[PDB]
Design a protein around this ligand. Structure first.
Ligand SMILES: C[S@@+](CC[C@H](N)C(=O)[O-])C[C@H]1O[C@@H](n2cnc3c(N)ncnc32)[C@H](O)[C@@H]1O
Ligand SMILES: C[S@@+](CC[C@H](N)C(=O)[O-])C[C@H]1O[C@@H](n2cnc3c(N)ncnc32)[C@H](O)[C@@H]1O
Lengths: 163, 163
């Protein structure tokens, strides 16, 4: 218990709108006293409309190589996958708290680019996490995720906010 | 087919952050050419932390009376409920398109305040829609919803955006 948790949001591409940036800064600020959190962005390939199957795969492969070069073998990797496992807000806090009680302290949340994640990234994942059956765009998704991490930490500390 | 669809987002409370306001204005602008959309806000009760069961109920009842006074008997009411039915993005477009083909053109999406929705509002609902098992705060939820309505209309028109 001599260590605070470490949360990394590892995402593909930069945010393009000032309002998403402002939302993320506010949740980073709110999460500051509870965990070290940092956001790491890696280059996104250009994503035209209707590319071939081949081209989609190559985009995911290039982005995947960048994502994997930023991940250490000992980190607990949680990949955001539409078709991953669904958890309630109390369920996400339970899963992180359980892993923390088990000694895990370095969590890396991974967000794919517009075409999703390469099989090698999905294979390295220690937990596939779905936020919904719906498809969220990657910029907004980053905000939704950090707000939910904020929520999970309030629940874990048993502090008011989740109504 | 002499009419465009009408989308109303009926929510409790005003937005407090300029960045959520900016996000909503951008999606309203993008949706403009495809549907009439408008956002109607009704007063939110104060929501302290840990109120009694009784007090929570009374908050939902007051907000519910305001919400129901803005709803017409012929509108198709879709209530956002964490425990409602889950749909994928293609599923939400299918449900709206199906209803439109059946003659429905006035859709009212309802977002509760921090404590959720009163039973009378939930009873008037023609469809309980869940966006996730997780709990989203009401301000962010409004953004997530309008982005998804934007997405459903692009899918329904068979126009690129959903990758
Ligand atoms: C536009 S989405 C991916 C669409 C792609 N067709 C797929 O099937 O993954 C971009 C990234 O955002 C994240 N994301 C979007 N919606 C999500 C959801 N409902 N649950 C978990 N992650 C989601 C995922 O990490 C995804 O790689
Ligand atoms: C903080 S939430 C409600 C929490 C309350 N304990 C409940 O059980 O409804 C405020 C409003 O946002 C909307 N909302 C939040 N998360 C949602 C989700 N995952 N799916 C559908 N609606 C949601 C709902 O309309 C809800 O009334």
């Amino acid at each position: 218990a001599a260590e605070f948790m470490k949360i990394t949001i590892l995402a593909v591409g930069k945010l393009k709108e000032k309002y998403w940036k402002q939302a993320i800064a506010e949740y980073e600020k709110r999460l500051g006293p509870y965990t070290k959190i940092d956001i790491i962005e890696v280059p996104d390939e250009k994503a035209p409309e209707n590319m071939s199957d081949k081209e989609i795969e190559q985009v995911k492969e290039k982005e995947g190589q960048r994502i994997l070069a930023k991940i250490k073998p000992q980190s607990t990797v949680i990949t955001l996958e539409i078709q991953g496992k669904m958890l309630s807000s109390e369920g996400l806090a339970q899963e992180l708290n359980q892993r923390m009680t088990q000694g895990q302290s370095d969590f890396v949340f991974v967000i794919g680019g517009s075409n999703g994640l390469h099989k090698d990234v999905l294979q390295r994942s220690n937990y596939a996490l779905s936020f919904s059956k719906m498809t969220f765009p990657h910029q907004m998704m980053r905000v939704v995720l950090i707000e939910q991490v904020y929520r999970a930490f309030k629940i874990m500390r048993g502090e008011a906010y989740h109504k």
